[PDB]
Structure formats: C-alpha cells, structure tokens
Predict the structure.
Amino acid sequence: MNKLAVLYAEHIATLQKRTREIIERENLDGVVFHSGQAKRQFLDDMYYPFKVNPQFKAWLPVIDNPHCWIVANGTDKPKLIFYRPVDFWHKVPDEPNEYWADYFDIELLVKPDQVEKLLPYDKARFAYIGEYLEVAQALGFELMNPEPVMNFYHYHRAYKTQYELACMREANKIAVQGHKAARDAFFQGKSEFEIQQAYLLATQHSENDNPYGNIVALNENCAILHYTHFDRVAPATHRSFLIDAGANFNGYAADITRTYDFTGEGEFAELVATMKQHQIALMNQLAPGKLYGELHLDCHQRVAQTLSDFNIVDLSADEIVAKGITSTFFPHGLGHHIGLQVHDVGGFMALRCTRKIEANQVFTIEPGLYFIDSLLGDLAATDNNQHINWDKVAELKPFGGIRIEDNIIVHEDSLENMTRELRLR
Amino acid sequence: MNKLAVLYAEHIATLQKRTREIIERENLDGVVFHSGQAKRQFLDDMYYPFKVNPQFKAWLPVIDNPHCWIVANGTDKPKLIFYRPVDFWHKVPDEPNEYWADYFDIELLVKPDQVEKLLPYDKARFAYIGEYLEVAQALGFELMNPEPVMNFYHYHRAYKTQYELACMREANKIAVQGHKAARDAFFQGKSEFEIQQAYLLATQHSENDNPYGNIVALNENCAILHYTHFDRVAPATHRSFLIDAGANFNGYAADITRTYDFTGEGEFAELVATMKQHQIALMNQLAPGKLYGELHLDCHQRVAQTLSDFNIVDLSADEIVAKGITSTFFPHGLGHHIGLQVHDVGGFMALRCTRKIEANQVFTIEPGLYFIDSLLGDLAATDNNQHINWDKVAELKPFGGIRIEDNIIVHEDSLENMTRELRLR
Ligand SMILES: [Mn+2]
Ligand SMILES: [Mn+2]
Ligand SMILES: [Mn+2]
Ligand SMILES: [Mn+2]
Ligand SMILES: [Mn+2]
Ligand SMILES: [Mn+2]
C-alpha cells in the first residue's frame, strides 16, 4: 500500500466537492484547467523552462507537461487530456500508470492543436482557467478565468488536504538535506557559488526544479534581501552565511532560511542565537483563531528587545517600537501561507494583520534583523540618528543580517514545524 | 591594455556602419533595441529567468538586465538607457564603468515606466526592435520589428567582428573545461545528474547561464536526440556517454558534443573512433565558397561507409545512400551557424544545401550515428528490412548513438576549430 495513494483519494474527493459547489453558485457546466505551454524566446528557437499553471497541478502531480487539460464538474469523473507526443526526438514515457491515473478519465494528446475534439462539444458554459486566453477563445471558450471561480479555489487552497500536507513534508525533507550540505560547505570556506552547487547536489534538484531562486549569501551580502547572484570567488574572510532555499515535491514547495556565524563565538553569533529563540517563540504562538497581526506586532517587539539588549540602539524596547525604527532593521513581513505556490493564495474575496490562523493551513515564520546601507542612512536623516550606537552598527554591518525561517503546519490540536522536526538547528 | 577592449571599438564601428546603411535604405531616423522584460509566472509573483533580446546584446555584453534601451542611427553616438533601480531590496551595482560604457551616451533608468522621457521626442520614424509590442505602441512607436530591418541585421550577424570571434573563443574555452570534468565523471561511474553537476561546477555556470539545455545522456539515452532529463540513479552498467553542452561569454555561445565508450575497447568504441575521423574530415572541408550542400551530401556518404564497413547494413556505401536509408541512422542536419544564438540567424532575405560558406562565419560540424527504436522499426516496414544486419543492431542498440560536434571559425585564409584547439579529443 501507498500512504500517498490512500490520501490522494480524499484529495480528489475534496477538489470534487469544491468544484460542485462553485459551478452551482456560478451556474456553470464545468471548469477547464489548462496546464499551460512552453514560452519561446524572442527571435529564437529555444524556450524558457516550463512552469505549470498552479491551478492545474492543484489536482495532480503532473508539473513538467504543457498542453494538458483537466475538465471537471465535481460529480462526474474528472477528464484529463494528457499530452504525450510521439517521435524519435523526445523520450516517450509510458502512459500514466501511477496511483493518481485511476482518478481521471484519461485521453492522450499527440499534438497540441488536436485538443478541440477531446474537449466538451459546447464550451460556452465551461470556465477556462489558464494563461492562454487567445488559445482558449479560438477553441470556443468565453469565460476567461472568471474572478469568482479564481477566488473560490484560491480561498480553499489555504486549507490543505492530507495528501497536500504529506507532499509538503516531503519537500521539507528534501530541502533540509540540502540546507545541511550547504551548511557544511560554508564552514569549509567555499564560495557562494560552490555552496549553491552543494545544495543542489544534496537535494538532487536542478536549478529550475526549486520553487524559487535560492539566496546563498555571504558576509555583507546577507543584508541584501533579494540577493540573486552567486559569487564564484570565495571571500578572503568568512564571517556570516545566510541561505534561503527550498525544494519541490509533487508541485508543493518548502521555503527555509538559516543564518550562521563562521566561528560560533562573538557578538553576531550571539545575535543569531537570540533571533533563533525569538523565532521559535513566534512559531510557538501559532494557533487556530490567532490573528496574524498579534504575531507581527510581537515580532517587531522582539526585534526592539534585541536592538535594545545588544546596544545597537540606545533606547528601551517599547520606545524603539514607539518611535518606529524597528522597521529599519526588519523591513519585511513575518510570514505567509505556503503550498503549491511559495507565497500561497487565499483570503476572503481577493498577509493582512487582520486574518486569523486556522487549522490545516501551512505557514512560514521568518523574523529577520539586517544592517542595510540605504535603510540605515535614511535613519540618520531623522531625529532618531541620535538614538543608535553607530559604533555598534559598523561592528556588525560586516555580517549583513539575519533571517531564520521554518514551514509549520497548524493542526487543529497542535503545531508541526516540519523544518525543525527534520533536525535543522 | 585590454585586447577585448581594442577589438570592441571596431565592433561598434561595424554595427554603426550597418545601422547607417539600413536606416537610409528604409528612410528611418533610427533604430531602438529593447533588451526586454522579465516574464511573470501565471497567478504567481515569481518570474521566469530573464533572456535578453538577441538584437540588443548584439551591441554590448549586458545580458542580465531588463528594461534597457539602445537608440541608434549609426552616425551619432548610440544612446543607452541603462536600467539601474535603487532600493534596499536588490544589490545596486556601480554605474557602467567597463570599456564598452565609453561607446554609448548613457542615461540611467530607475523605474521601467520612466523611459518615455529618455527616448526620442518623435518616435514615429524609429523602428522598435523588441518583444513588447504593446509597451512600444504605448510609448508611441509604430514600426514594430519591420521585416526589412530584421533581415538586414540578421544577414550581417553571419559575419563576426573580431570582438565577436574573441568572445566565442572564450565561450569555447569555458565549455571545454566543463566537457573534460564531465568526461572524468562518466569514467568514475557517476549518474547523468552527477555528470551534469560536474560540468556546471567546472564551467562555473548556473543551469540558466548556459546557452541551451545540456544533454547529458547515458547508454540507451544517447539515442534520444532531444534528451532533456537527468537520471539521478546511475546505470547498473556503464556503456556509452554522450554530452552535448555549451557555455556563454558576453552573450556568445559554444555548442559542443562528445560521445565516449566506457571501456575504450570494442565495436562501439571503434565506431566512435571512426565517426571522429569522419567528423574531422568534414571540418576539414570547410572553406570560403564551399556549398554547405556538398558537406551535407558527403556526411551521409561517410555514414553509409560506416554502416557498410561495420556490417550494420549488408550493402555497399553507394547503395545505402542510393536506397536512402542513411537518414534512419543520421536523421538531423550536419551543422549550423552559431554566435549570439546557438542556431544563429542569417541568409539572403529570410541550413539550406544552397548557401555558401564564407570568411568570418562560425560553424558547428556535428555528424551523428544513432540507433533509434521508432526510426529503426519504420525501416523494417520497408523492402530494405532485408538489407540490415538486425543482429548487429541489437548489439549496438544498448549504446544509443554517436555525435561529435565542434565550433569552427572560417577565416579567409584558414580554419580554426576552437574546440579541438582547446585539446578536446
Ligand atoms: Mn476516456
Ligand atoms: Mn524564504
Ligand atoms: Mn518565505
Ligand atoms: Mn547623456
Ligand atoms: Mn550541440
Ligand atoms: Mn549544434
């Protein structure tokens, strides 16, 4: 028996039920999900790597196949037009024969432009959920990504089926293996580039297989939030390491961050150790009914208590917050839902400090503390310039910043930190 | 002094001259090249990796920056609107300060929608060369990628400036380092995936940095022409290895293939050694004035002579060709131009067996010999089924196929095989 296979049955039942409800509320005959197509590079005969329509992979783990269509109404067996071309050029895989194949009425498609005869005869009442409006209109569809249908599925995406939670445990498990290998590489003095290679090797992921662009930062780079590049030359001296990297499994993402001190001793190393405690205490505050806003406000508080205690700012926690200067050391949000998409969808009628945490949802808790040139300089142009220990700043500035991030499943009865349960210190 | 820098001056002069000629022939005030934009994934806040407009990087080595614009007329100094946003989020690089920066009148762009005021006041007579027609029309442009202008630049792209040839030598040099590391990994019994990782490490290339999707094939996979995947599990037995991989330098590509036998002894290993000889003799036939057609017809001849001598087909070379069955063992073209694009552009008014090889052009010579299921089975359904040693086929089938490919610069006085001159056996 396959645990995933058993959970999948309920997954399908759940999407089926959700489908029945929405087509009735909108008087539709059904919904058609288009996996998408490969995008061709301008004036070239090369293509950008394929990225499946999230709304299509929500149903099954087929994420590397364009020209696939799902037609469903929630009561009848969902139809799956599965693109399987034949030609000596590409390797032809066997016909879908895994556990999920049984849940669909599968029609094979040998050429993309032969899909019209496999779709409903009258497409007018079928909502087209996909990126290719022009192709949909030519086929006869009229309802393009109707907002009410998008909002419905997105809202329910926040509530993960057991199959989804299982998939997400797997993604976290792969990512963790990578974060450890990346960790070891850092302590060996490797370059950002080399560290990235180790992560990919340990997770057996190709760059285009991870859920987002990995951030493998060293020293001052740790202060660059959207740091995309990988230096090929190792730094003369190794001070800090920040790696925000994830993994994929059946279309579900992991999104983990870890910051380290090269020596394990000193101010920065202590700062990290503190942030970790604050980070865990924040994870610990997740519970059904809890307002994300409280968690957020609390994070800024912890940050202020950190800035105060490390003499980075010569003021009391409450006054650091009061004066509103914590945002210069922690400029981003505390967390977000995650699942099929890294920054997952959801929320009443299209992360606000107003929504409540609920069971079966999955979150990331990622408090941070950075020393950003631009953001700091701005703080100097205010009457608060007199309140920070600029000597303490220049001493840490060389370490860039800190961020610790886990993915946690909020069960009705408890919290499951997939990341730390995998033993990622 | 910088050799590249000195060659670049002439590069600019050349593009300038080409620009003057075309705008006069088409009565235009100038030409505007748009580097492009990042494409956002459907319903997500993630983007596909950026791919620069080839027509924009033809001018300078800026290939990772969207929202950049070049406006030129060929007599005045070309203008370069260089996107350089500022914000604590992304790492801000210094203002362009390399050798090529001096050849342009550089305006910095901090936000994509602030480009209108930096472009010509009257855009009507400026041809827009780019992918974003909608954005161009909103800015006021009317002439969208006019065919005569596209054809002109494309035609001249076949003739490489010295700067371009130098760039291409560099790409070949990086790729070779990778092909050797990949080679060693194969002999160590690593998996396709592991071999791919070694190649990337040796070339210091991220997957999205190479010019096309690497083909790292093992055993039977060597017979799959468009083989994209990388098995994570090494084969029980290592028989054959085929790696078609390249590299980039300033936007110019290398495109190299090499096939190996695991033991270095046996039929297949002998077959490879022969193909190499045929491959080199084909490279040797490149010369200004030569018709690609002769080279092509000659390749099929060599293939037939190979099939005949290895008793893969019980017929004489001439009759293998005569009966037209070589195409089942060698189904693709012999070579193509290469440069800014792997399959480079060019040719009289938008690789034909009719065009002639000329000086300063760059080519790939890639004869192959494969054992493809589908293609072979088809040969069985013909009266030629009685002509092939099906016992000899089943013996080689397990090795997949062969392809050897080099990139060669055709100088007016000689041939320069960048690949073999780098010592890639
Ligand atoms: Mn059926
Ligand atoms: Mn993250
Ligand atoms: Mn995150
Ligand atoms: Mn200027
Ligand atoms: Mn190739
Ligand atoms: Mn090629």
